[model samples]
Target: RPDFCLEPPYTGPCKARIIRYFYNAKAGLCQTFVYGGCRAKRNNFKSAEDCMRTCGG
Candidate 1:
């Protein structure tokens, strides 16, 4: 798994709550979350497929 996948979901420090996906390395799955629209970390993905492709294994 990628290191970024292990990082906690970073919703950022903004107010906009956009739907997003992130890989939960411990759970070994992609989980849905609300993004804060700015400064998203590498673990954040625009789509579920993207997160799975990157770290779902």
Candidate 2:
């Protein structure tokens, strides 16, 4: 479900792209974070746009 888990492990409504992004308030911009291939939570984002849309693009 979109509550407990995200993609890679199961092909849900998440991204298959390895390169994920999240917002970095310290840098004040979108930053890259390694997904470790599976078991990601609500913090994983497919693109910078997606990441920004959730946190702040």
Candidate 3:
């Protein structure tokens, strides 16, 4: 089964948008960030909920 919901690449002021995700020990959840839709890892998640649910956020 799939691990998380992957959101198709988003749009940015330029072309595409990138959302970075990782576990935040302090908040005990997966945190997210936006970028210029640059090439990323397969683990990249579409949303916080997706990341959290997949990565134990």
Candidate 4:
């Protein structure tokens, strides 16, 4: 897991939709990496647009 904690004001004991994911097939890989993170995944993009706005920002 990423081990990331949500920021303050989000402690209301509730949950909602967070990040999303999509594949960038154009630039994705067909092979594995040294870390093995991208081993099976052909998608280069880790997460979708919503994830980028939240976690990546």
Tell me the tens digit of each residue's lDDT in model 2 across 1-57.
222122222223445546667566556556776665666666567777776666663
Clashing pairs in 3: none
- TM-score comparison, 1 vs 3, better candidate: 1
TM-score result, candidate 1: 0.91
User: Could you say which candidate leads in lDDT?
Assistant: 1
Candidate 4, residue 55: lDDT: 38
- Go through the candidates in order and give each one's C-alpha lDDT: 0.90, 0.55, 0.54, 0.28
Best by TM-score: 1
Candidate ranking under lDDT, highest first, comes to 1, 2, 3, 4
Candidate 3's residue-wise lDDT over 24-56, tens digit each?
Answer: 545556666665575554446666666677766
Give stretches of model 1 more than 4 Å off.
none
The superposed Cα distance between candidate 3 and the true structure at residue 28, in angstroms, equals 2.5
Give TM-scores for every candidate, taking all chains together and pairing residue i with residue i: 0.91, 0.55, 0.44, 0.21
Q: What is the C-alpha RMSD of each candidate to the true structure, in Å?
A: 0.9, 7.7, 7.0, 14.6
Q: For residues 1-57, what per-residue lDDT tens digits would candidate 4 score against the true structure?
A: 111312211212224333224322233312211222322222222344433343343
Quote the positional error of residue 5 for candidate 3 in Å: 15
The superposed Cα distance between candidate 4 and the true structure at residue 47, in angstroms, equals 6.6
